[PDB]
């Protein structure tokens, strides 16, 4: 029913103290962790992971609570879905594989896990790539009318439960397809492999999966913001070499010029626009893959 | 089935070029137009309108597209649900009753119609009361993280059709009750007459009515903002004596001191907080009715 989009990749259930992380694992060479975002799963990497697997051991993980990874129980402060907790859990998952120093590329929510990981435990990362995000602090700080309309879901999904859970349940298939379509350049689903969309749709069909996504956005509005705020105020920069990729019509370039923003957050950051909407690895897999392989090889 | 909450009030279907306005009509004396907002209907005035009917000809109108008023078909610019168009339609409606000069009190969306009416056609108004709002421009201009979370529905309901409509359609009862409860001081529905809630619920149960509400919010995000922006940047002030009432726990006071804001928009404005959430005429009817009687009688 659900297609295997990573031929030659194994499937691993990585145990952590907070639950299992699901990951497809392929290739050999230095470890490279790939983190998806919302409303996707690891399969969003299916077009770039094979090219990366030529040079790296590629670990394509479902974020905690996403896809087939376990859903740790949340609490009053959405703690397990804060990027800090997710980062700690993925660090632990990587340690189960013996990877204590690895390359990391994240898109959307996974890119927020990624830069928070880079801020909290920089020694874990050889190089970091973030796809089509600015730091969470920067999105909220740039909140204005235009941005509020563009990323309305940042405030919608952060509403107290069960408000977004109830509404998302009103038409989950429409919602996930609408989010996928509206953030591509084309404005429809033609950029996606339909087997990939089926993965995203099935994940989104689970009410517990949707609640987790809301918890993630709740963390995004609260604890994630405060964690970012601490770093901004302390002048903490990401010391890892990092690559910022954004879509020419993605979400990140809607708020500011992404490289200028990331230079305030990272001491060694390169960046390039990709002719694409938000979903760089699916809308522009070749340009995304090439930029990633070049950066992660140096 | 729906209760008559205005014993002794007439019922009128006022024809306008944009469709029929429904209104309850009671009392005698100077004409006083009362405009509800979202997600309510004219019945929200059922506790204060009898007090006002002792001294005024009270016209308790459903907004264009709301309640029992006709729903003009919208367009790509949400024109009929812009506050400018709504104001024009209500001017037409009042003219059908022979009221070319009248007092006006609006709450929520109806308050936005009201101040826009006062800016576009101040000669139509003897006095103006706005209940628990700031100008649409000011909400958007003050859109930061905290406020984007508080009034997320401003950006959510402004999302392109059919996204909000599809989400609202899964369980419309939940949403209307959630919004009613969440903006009251108590955070539940105890402030409302259950017969009134039934009116609100039944109106919200109609997908066309929900569409209109989203159109109203889309206008609120685009053309309404643009019209306000023109006025504020041109320094155009409301010249009609006006009363700004707001709930101490309401929406307007959340991101600004309401009277300071209104003093920028109106040359002759007095204000008073009322111990209440957003729904002043139902949460604090006596206090609201007294403030309005005192103001419109002076």
Author numbering:
A (entry chain B), B (entry chain A): 3 to 300
What did the study's authors say about this model?
To demonstrate this, data were collected on chips containing FAcD with two different oscillation angles: 1° (Chip 1) and 3° (Chip 2). A complete FAcD dataset required the collection of data from >10 000 crystals, with at least 3318 images used in the final refinement; in this study, with 1° oscillation, we collected 2626 datasets and only 494 were used in the final refinement. On average, 1° of exposure at 10° s−1 led to ∼70 kGy of dose per crystal.
Here, we describe a high-throughput approach to serial oscillation crystallography. Using the silicon microchip technology with fast translation that has proven to be useful for serial collection of still data from crystals at XFELs and synchrotrons, we have found that adding oscillation to crystal data collection dramatically decreases the number of crystals needed to generate a complete dataset, compared with still data collection. We tested three different protein crystals for this study: FAcD, lysozyme and CO-SWMb. The high-throughput, fixed-target serial oscillation crystallography method described here is a practical, fast and economical means to collect high-quality room-temperature diffraction data with minimized background scattering.
